[PDB]
RNA sequence: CACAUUCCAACCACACCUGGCGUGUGGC
DNA sequence: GCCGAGCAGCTTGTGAGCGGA
DNA sequence: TCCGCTCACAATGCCACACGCGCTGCTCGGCCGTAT
């Protein structure tokens, strides 16, 4: 249940770009069957993505480094 | 994954090997058979197989002999999907051009290749068919010839003179036309001729023929060399009969046939390939059973049955739920309620998904089976797909951005939507049977851009202004205003208590009253410079309700926002200072206890009006005794004959208004009184506790005039004509409304009613033009970094402050850098965002105007930047890129459009209009600075003005202006420059009924080029004795006086001409026609007084300001009746030849010859006389003027500027709050068109309106070079027009004109960058605008 | 309507003339219309269906 | 009256309406203009086309919301290819680009 | 010799009819 | 002369005249 | 001979009617349905 997320708009340049990282994270996320890092309420995967995106360890730059570092490491382990 | 589209002829040979395969067979299908026809209509190698991995026999299904096709059937196993994408083609007899490319207003066949549009049907239809190869004939290369010279042509040329018919003869035509070698000609002759009407032909020809040889184009491209098929699925049975034809032809034409028999054969094809183009444009009425004709390609592809207008932009959608709504006032903000079925049936999916994705459904069946049994273990899964999956709530009618919202839903019974009570005032949606529908995003892109962007408690700021539109509503501020209202005497009057606890315990407990002022301990937190409270403990001397009040509001809000009686005005006020200092986070939750408090004590409280609580006002008999013997009094008098009807009517009018308004101020101020309380003494009147003064008072639901229709007098109603009756209603809704005065109230009452629907039925077509003209703009660039902009100044015009500076400019980045009136101040520099404190300091340093941003400053091309835009208006930052601000602004101009009645007695001159009152007069007391300062002392000590744009302002004791007053043309004001005058008096005066000729300097007047019974008549005054002599006008002048204009040559005491100083020339006096002369020659003329009062009309008066369609007429620039003409060149005027119909003038500047002719009514005057050497751009005519001239001789922001200043009139007029930058931007988006005025060395001429953002981005490449760019000029236009006069064809095709603008699209040959809106609409693509902007330059950074 | 003859007048600014107009209609139960109007000019003109 | 999904018209393969029959609701121009206001990109693809317009699109985004995958096919529709080609048909090249 | 299109133990394939709408003509 | 199908009995703007000096 | 001025569409726009989406007999115009 998120109720506000002012705190969100102020943490990324504007809410464009914030509900794209978010739906990517979102799509690696449940239809991506990964793991997240923050401690769930029994949800859905779009409040604790918003609350992911709230504390700051995942945004743009962190999601792309990670797809790309993933990559790499699965393009090594194919050799 | 989509460029930009574009749309014009190229490469026949690729359209034709695009498809495959042939279907000659004029039969359309072998139904009895069930091979695959290989020729026919249903064809296989054209489309495919009858269905998907299965041949059309029927004799094999399986996947085993895929890649041989059958021993006779020729289907290739594929899917069945390629027959609704694959073509192939219908044989052709002759290769036909169009028809359809002649009712294009003009022809497309014939404006292309220098011939006439009849020359060219009568080619290609069978009138007169065009002889080609003549021989050693002295005919031209590109002549057309008739069958009669074709005929007798034949005898002196028997073989070597030959001609063709329709198709194949346009083939030949086009094939042999060279026209590169007609382009030069064409380009050639222009530059050779010289005219108007040619001159707009053949410029119109080379632009259309220049796009089309720069293009990949060519001539005989136009020729349909190839025609394909239409697939089945999709006419048919016409290109049947064009197949049959072709058959016909093949036939008939192999066995070479003579040349009339094929010459008749192709001119069939020919006809039967333009009913394919088009039904009704060929000249044939084909039908298809019983007078019901087919179409061709289209019917009518605009209104609700079209299908690039109506099916790909609006139709309907599944997954939505439509039902009723109701008060649910106990669900959070954020939330709202659903009932139980709706959700259930609106989500079986998703319940089939989460049964699934457990093992409590394996299967669908069964799973479905579970669910339309609904057992009770399912309710479960229904809550928890529900839990964080909220859904959209949407209004019917759709005016602003909140008419689609998102909501969290929870469960309830009822098939009954419950909504939350602090929303509905944003939905426009009251509880008297309002139904609502509900959407699902069923996406989680969709579910996560409705929870981050359209969620409730992320839109608490309207679009329009930045005042929250969560405002709490009557029930709410009533309860809070019963409880804040403090008496004084009560339950525990004058204790003491330590804590608001404290409070709520003696309250619900019952030992002391709800409202008793008492000392309280308060332990409030000030905002510190940081992030930071600090807490300070007080004991506050304040009423019990508003300590209780105290345990809602957060610690940030300080204490004195309480301490008042919390009207509707101030609880909005307390929500936006709690909104301003603490952010939007605790709002949220302040606002959901503030209305669950203000519900739960306004159920406590129990208020409730009765028969008793509206006291009557005993002095009101006596004063409707008073003023009815009065106006008997008055109505004696007239009929003793004294006064005439009109005076003692409006003298009955105005006794009456007087009497009603007394009775008002009576009955309001018995209101408040007789409430009086012993509180330890003996009278302590103090506010009335009255229930309908606590409900209007209280700003809650009751207003003024309701309570004073209500307890005292109605008033006055009027008839449809707006003439107040004299007739009062003598009652009020208490006492008994006899039978006429019910009569006549519904007699008024039944017009507004009916306006009020019209006017609601009316505003959805203003609204979509406003959306249609401004959607093709999106906030792409960041910073366009430029240093325009726009003077913004507080609306001081007439009142004192109309509207102040702040609330004009907060919102914004100002263009230039604000200097304090201390030199050399930048306190506020170039590029800086303002807030509240900014603005607060831009009062304080005492600033008048402030150069702001604007959307026509942002130099960006094809979109304007969020630099120089503003704020969000919505969310208190910097607004961002990619957001489609134009339909925000749509939206919030277009919404409020429910409070603009269209005309019920407002004509501006209801009152009075005269100019004898127009003597000024003030307030403020200052210095007073003057605007085209001519004012010159005269021979009696007084201060005379002699000029028009003379504009009196008052600088405050600050140094800004406060009043601004226009002087009539030559008054006379008793004041002058830098006069330290005091306020409240009125210092000019002037004549409405004629215009002075008053003088500047002394001496003497004679009839200098003057004389009588020629131009000038002999007439007598009956009211003083002295002949008043008229000169004549160009109506009652004979021929040997038409060549003679009168006037007064002003002299000195001598008698010799007078030596103006400052210059050389001598000024004297004309005067034109129809005019009237009192003081005549040789006279001792004293300066600065009327000697010649030459008549002019003061009694016209048309104005329509108070109405929607004045705001119509603005937006779309329409021509008034009688417009306010200006000058276009400066320099003086002089009058040439008239009565060519009507009167005509000219102009001639200092620096130019006399090129510029005007006419002008007989029934206009003129503003300023010949010998005033006026500056262009001057008011010539009072009254409306045309913003046409306004734009093109007064500059960019001027017109503008007036534009917003109308309609914030107009909305001020209606109360109705609005920010600048909607209109801003519309206003921005009405002259996106701009024409040349001076070729240069560009490869365009002045003769194109070519679109400004495009000539800009042309003079981009000439900015590098020395070459000159180009000379734009700016000419806005309608909406409507700029709509229509849209770059995008996609845009444009599906908007109105359907059939003009798809024809004048399809036609066109150009390509469009799609950079806005409603193509993507068209398209289904992903827009431009939201979450897929920046997927869109996701998807440009590599590519 | 009831059949017969009524008199209408184009007043306010009709025809951008400010000069109101004036016209005759005359109506049966059932059959063809009449109407006798003026214009801006001074010649009176006739009007069927 | 609401409706999950449900039966299509004949002449066109889009819902019906009737609170008697398993009908939905008319999105009206009005809330087109609304939605796009505000961004919602995705959400007005999938209200157009995924829901009304795309015959197996909507059915693909079924089957994939019946097994869990809460992920939207863009699904280019089939009838923009086939204004397309009668654009193409028309005399016309479609000069589309990207 | 040659293409090759097969008479088809649990069971995936054999699922649904319908509304209000449309055509043409005329009007400014 | 033989078969198949339709028809009946029942407000903004522009191109093109039309005066208009 | 170009320039005002206005009318017939062209088409925002809706509206009205005839009817058809599931009448039958008559009268004028074009007729050869697997290695068809
Ligand atoms: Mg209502
Ligand atoms: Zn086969
Ligand atoms: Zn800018």
């Known amino acids: 249940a998120r109720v506000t997320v002012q705190d969100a708009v102020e943490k990324i340049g504007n809410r464009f770009d914030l509900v794209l990282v978010a739906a990517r994270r979102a799509r690696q996320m449940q239809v991506g069957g990964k793991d997240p890092l923050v401690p769930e309420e029994n949800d859905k995967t779009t409040v604790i993505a918003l609350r992911e995106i709230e504390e700051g360890l995942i945004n743009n730059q962190i999601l792309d480094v990670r797809e790309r570092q993933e990559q790499q490491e699965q393009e090594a382990a194919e050799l | 994954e989509f460029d930009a589209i574009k749309i014009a002829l190229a490469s026949p040979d690729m359209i034709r090997s695009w498809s495959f395969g042939e279907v000659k067979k004029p039969e359309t299908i072998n139904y009895r058979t069930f091979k695959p026809e290989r020729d026919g209509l249903f064809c296989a190698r054209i489309f495919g197989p009858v269905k998907d991995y299965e041949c059309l026999c029927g004799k094999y299904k399986r996947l085993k002999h895929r890649g041989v096709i059958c021993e006779k059937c020729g289907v290739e196993v594929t899917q069945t999907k390629v027959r609704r994408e694959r073509m192939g083609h219908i044989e052709l007899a002759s290769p036909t051009a169009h028809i359809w490319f002649l009712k294009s207003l003009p022809s497309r066949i014939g404006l292309l290749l220098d011939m006439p549009l009849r020359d060219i049907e009568r080619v290609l239809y069978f009138e007169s068919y065009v002889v080609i190869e003549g021989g050693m004939t002295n005919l031209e290369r590109q002549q057309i010839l008739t069958e009669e010279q074709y005929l007798d042509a034949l005898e002196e040329f028997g073989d070597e003179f030959d001609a063709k018919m329709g198709a194949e003869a346009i083939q030949a035509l086009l094939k042999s036309m060279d026209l590169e070698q007609e382009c030069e000609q064409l380009r050639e002759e222009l530059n050779e001729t010289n005219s108007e009407t040619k001159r707009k032909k053949l410029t119109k020809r080379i632009k259309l023929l220049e796009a089309f040889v720069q293009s990949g184009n060519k001539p005989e491209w136009m020729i349909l060399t190839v025609l394909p098929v239409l697939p089945p699925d999709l006419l048919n049975d016409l290109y049947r009969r064009v197949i049959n034809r072709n058959n016909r032809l093949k036939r008939l034409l192999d066995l070479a046939a003579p040349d009339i028999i094929v010459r008749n054969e192709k001119r069939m094809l020919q006809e039967a390939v333009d009913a394919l183009l088009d039904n009704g444009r060929r000249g044939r009425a084909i039908t298809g059973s019983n007078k019901r004709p087919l179409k061709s390609l289209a019917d009518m592809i605009k209104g609700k049955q079209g299908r690039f207008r109506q099916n790909l932009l609006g139709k309907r959608v599944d997954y939505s739920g439509r039902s009723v709504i109701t008060v649910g006032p106990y669900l959070r903000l954020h939330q709202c309620g659903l009932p139980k079925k709706m959700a259930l049936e609106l989500f079986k999916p998703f319940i089939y998904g989460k049964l699934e994705l457990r093992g409590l459904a394996t299967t669908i069946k069964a799973a479905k089976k579970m669910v339309e049994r609904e057992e009770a273990v399912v309710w479960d899964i229904l809550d928890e797909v529900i839990r964080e999956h909220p859904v959209l709530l949407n209004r019917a009618p759709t005016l602003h951005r909140l008419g689609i919202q998102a909501f969290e839903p929870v469960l309830i019974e009822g098939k009954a939507i419950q909504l939350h009570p602090l929303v ?429 941003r604007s959307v026509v400053s942002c130099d960006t091309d094809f979109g304007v930047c969020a630099h120089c835009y503003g704020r969000d208006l919505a969310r208190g930052h910097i607004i961002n890129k990619g957001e489609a601000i134009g339909v925000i602004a749509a939206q919030s101009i277009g919404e409020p459009g429910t409070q603009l009645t269209m005309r019920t007695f407002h004509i501006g001159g209801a009152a009075s209009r005269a100019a004898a009152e127009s003597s000024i007069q003030v307030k403020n007391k200052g210095s007073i600075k003057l605007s085209n300062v001519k004012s010159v002392v005269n021979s009696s000590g007084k201060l005379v003005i002699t000029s028009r744009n003379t504009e009196l302002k008052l600088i405050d004791e600050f140094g800004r202006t406060k009043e601004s007053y226009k002087v009539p043309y030559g008054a006379v004001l008793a004041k002058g420059d830098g006069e330290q005058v005091a306020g409240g008096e009125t210092v000019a005066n002037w004549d409405p009924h004629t215009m002075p000729v008053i003088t500047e300097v002394s001496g003497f007047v004679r009839f200098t080029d003057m004389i009588d019974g020629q131009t000038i008549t002999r007439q007598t005054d009956e009211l003083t004795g002295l002949s008043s002599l008229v000169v004549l006008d160009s109506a009652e002048r004979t021929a040997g006086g038409k060549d003679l204009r009168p006037a007064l040559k002003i002299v000195d005491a001598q008698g010799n001409d007078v030596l103006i100083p400052g210059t050389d020339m001598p000024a004297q006096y004309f005067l034109p026609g129809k005019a009237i002369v009192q003081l005549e020659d040789g006279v001792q003329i004293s300066s600065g007084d009327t000697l010649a009062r030459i008549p002019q009309e003061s009694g016209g008066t048309k104005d329509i300001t108070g109405g929607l369609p004045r705001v119509a007429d603005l937006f779309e620039a329409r021509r008034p009746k009688e417009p306010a003409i200006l000058a276009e060149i400066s320099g003086i005027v002089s009058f040439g030849k008239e009565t060519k119909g009507k009167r005509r003038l000219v102009i001639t500047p200092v620096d130019g010859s006399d090129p510029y002719e005007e006419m002008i009514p007989k029934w206009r005057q003129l503003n300023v006389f010949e010998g005033e050497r006026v500056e262009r751009g001057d008011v010539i005519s009072d009254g409306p003027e045309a913003p046409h001239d306004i734009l093109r001789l007064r500059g960019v922001h001027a017109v503008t500027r007036y534009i917003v200043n109308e309609v914030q009139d107009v909305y001020r007029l209606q109360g109705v709050k609005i920010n600048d930058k909607h209109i801003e931007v519309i206003v921005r988006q009405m002259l996106r068109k701009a024409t040349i005025v001076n070729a240069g060395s560009s490869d365009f001429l002045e003769g194109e309106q070519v679109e400004y953002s495009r000539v800009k981005i042309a003079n981009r490449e000439l900015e590098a070079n020395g070459k000159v760019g180009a000379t734009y000029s700016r000419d806005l236009l309608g909406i409507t027009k700029a709509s229509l006069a849209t770059e995008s064809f996609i845009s444009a095709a599906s908007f109105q004109e359907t059939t003009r603008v798809l024809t004048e699209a399809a036609v066109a040959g150009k390509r469009d960058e799609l950079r806005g809106l409603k193509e993507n609409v068209i398209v289904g693509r992903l827009i431009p605008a939201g979450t897929g902007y920046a997927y869109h330059q996701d998807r440009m950074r590599r590519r | 309507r009831s059949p017969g003859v009524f008199f209408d007048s184009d007043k306010g600014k009709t025809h951008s003339s400010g000069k109101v107009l004036y016209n005759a209609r005359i109506i049966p139960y059932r059959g063809s219309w009449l109407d006798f109007e003026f214009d801006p000019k001074d010649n009176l003109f006739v009007r069927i269906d | 009256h609401a409706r999950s999904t449900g039966s299509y018209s004949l002449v066109t393969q889009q819902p019906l309406g009737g609170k008697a029959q398993f009908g939905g609701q008319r999105f009206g121009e009005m809330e087109v203009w609304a939605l796009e206001a505000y961004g919602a990109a995705y959400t007005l693809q999938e209200m157009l086309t995924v829901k009304s317009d795309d015959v197996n699109g909507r059915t693909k985004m079924y089957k994939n919301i019946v097994d869990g995958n809460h992920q939207m096919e863009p699904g280019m529709p089939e009838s923009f290819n086939v204004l397309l080609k009668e654009i193409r048909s028309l005399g016309i090249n479609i000069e589309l680009e990207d």
Not at chain 2, 554 to 581: D, E, F, H, W
Not at chain 2, 582 to 597: E, H, N, R, S
Not at chain 2, 639 to 659: H, M
Not at chain 2, 814 to 828: C, F, R, S, W
């Open chain 2, 424 to 852: 509905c005032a944003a939905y426009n949606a009251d509880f008297d049977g309002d139904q609502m529908a509900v959407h699902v995003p069923l996406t989680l892109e969709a579910q996560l851009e409705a929870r981050a962007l359209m969620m409730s408690t992320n839109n608490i700021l309207s679009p329009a202004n930045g005042e929250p539109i969560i405002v709490p509503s009557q029930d709410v501020v009533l309860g809070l205003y019963y409880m804040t209202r403090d008496c004084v005497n009560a339950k525990g009057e004058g204790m003491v208590l330590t804590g608001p606890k404290e409070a709520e315990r003696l309250y619900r407990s019952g030992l002391a009253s709800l409202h008793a002022r008492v000392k309280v301990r308060i332990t409030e937190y000030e905002k510190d410079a940081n992030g930071e409270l600090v807490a300070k403990t007080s004991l506050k001397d304040t009423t019990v309700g508003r300590a209780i009040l105290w345990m809602i509001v957060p610690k940030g809000l300080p204490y004195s926002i309480v301490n008042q009686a919390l009207g509707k005005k101030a609880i909005s006020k307390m929500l936006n200072t709690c909104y301003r200092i603490l952010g939007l986070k605790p709002t949220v939750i302040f606002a959901d206890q503030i209305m669950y408090t203000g519900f739960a004590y306004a159920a406590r409280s129990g208020a409730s009006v009765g028969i008793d609580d509206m006291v009557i006002p005993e002095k009101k008999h006596e004063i409707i005794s008073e003023a009815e013997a009065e106006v008997a009094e008055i109505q004696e008098q007239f009929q003793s004959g004294l006064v005439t009807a009109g005076e003692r009517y409006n003298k009955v009018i105005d006794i009456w208004a007087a009497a009603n308004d007394r009775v008002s101020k009576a009955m309001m101020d018995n209101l408040q009184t007789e409430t009086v309380i012993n509180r330890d003494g003996q009278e302590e009147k103090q506010v009335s506790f009255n229930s309908i003064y606590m409900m209007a008072d209280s700003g809650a639901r009751g207003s003024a005039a309701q309570i004073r229709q209500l307890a005292g007098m109605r008033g006055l109603m009027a008839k449809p004509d707006g003439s107040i009756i004299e007739t009062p209603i003598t009652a009020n809704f208490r006492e008994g409304l006899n039978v006429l005065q019910y009569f006549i109230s519904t007699h008024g009452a039944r017009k507004g009613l009916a306006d009020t629907a019209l006017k609601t039925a009316n505003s959805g077509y203003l609204t979509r033009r406003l959306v249609d003209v401004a959607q093709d703009l999106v906030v792409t660039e960041d910073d366009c970094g430029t240093h325009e902009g726009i003077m913004m100044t507080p609306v001081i015009e007439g009142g004192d402050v109309k509207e102040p500076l702040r609330d004009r400019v907060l919102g914004r980045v100002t263009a230039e850098d604000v200097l304090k009136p201390g030199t050399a101040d930048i306190l506020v520099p170039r590029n800086t965002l303002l807030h509240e404190q900014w603005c607060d300091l831009l009062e304080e340093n005492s600033v008048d105007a402030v150069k702001v």
